[PDB]
Amino acid sequence: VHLTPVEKSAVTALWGKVNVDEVGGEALGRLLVVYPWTQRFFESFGDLSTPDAVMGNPKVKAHGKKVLGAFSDGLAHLDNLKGTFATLSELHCDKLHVDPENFRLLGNVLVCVLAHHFGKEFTPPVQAAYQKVVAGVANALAHKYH
């Protein structure tokens, strides 16, 4: 878990066409609807009783946007992600209690949004860069557990 500038660049350069906000209330969005026990965390939120409910909830578009803005920024510090979210991870660990296998289930429910949103440009190979980046964030998201 080191990325390559070839790749490393697919991430951060195709990222570019990304509108954060609708990318997050959906990724954020398909998690809670595809891995139902991530619900775990938000009965705080309202009706998460249906895809529809789910997915329509502002409280959820609300947090996802917030969850992928913080994202954006870390594609900004790729060389340094552990680097970037430590603070950001103690926090989910120490405080938030999140069962960090939720980082990989979102990286991937989000490889999937990106799937759906970009179509033919989401090539195998940007797909894949896309793939170590979600995995390492996943993993820098994770380094402060104990």
Binding site: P51, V111, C112, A115, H116, G119, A128, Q131
Partner: protein, 141 residues
């Protein structure tokens, strides 16, 4: 279990597949290998360059597989009966890739349906490749 909610849902994005079928199966297998590289372990004598004629029939070969499964979704385990016998004794692929080939399908699957891919839908879908993948992992031990 997959619910009948689940069923139609599957039968249905699968219908738009129909016949590109073979091709979602190779682009499949093709992000397979560039993203999860390790899977590659399984095909030491397969030509896996972009385009391999091998990968290609692999995929009509992987796909035809799932059409079978789908057309059979209730009879799922006698369905794939025989293939079941097949990766468990013949190739004895670790189990962990299953979960790996399932996801990237999803994603071509994914990325091929602009419209077709409700998360309503998308969940139905992760969901049938895991039984689909459980069947198959069934005679391992």
């Amino acid at each position: 279990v997959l619910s009948p909610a689940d069923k139609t849902n599957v039968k249905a994005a699968w219908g738009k597949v129909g016949a590109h079928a073979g091709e979602y199966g190779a682009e499949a297998l093709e992000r397979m290998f560039l993203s999860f590289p390790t899977t590659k372990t399984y095909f030491p004598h397969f030509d896996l360059s972009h385009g391999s004629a091998q990968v290609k029939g692999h995929g009509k070969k992987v796909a035809d597989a799932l059409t079978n499964a789908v057309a059979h979704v209730d009879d799922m385990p006698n369905a794939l009966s025989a293939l079941s016998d097949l990766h468990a004794h013949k190739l004895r692929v670790d189990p962990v890739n299953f979960k790996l080939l399932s996801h990237c399908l999803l994603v071509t699957l994914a990325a091929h349906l602009p419209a077709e891919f409700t998360p309503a839908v998308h969940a139905s879908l992760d969901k049938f490749l895991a039984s689909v993948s459980t069947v198959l992992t069934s005679k391992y031990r």
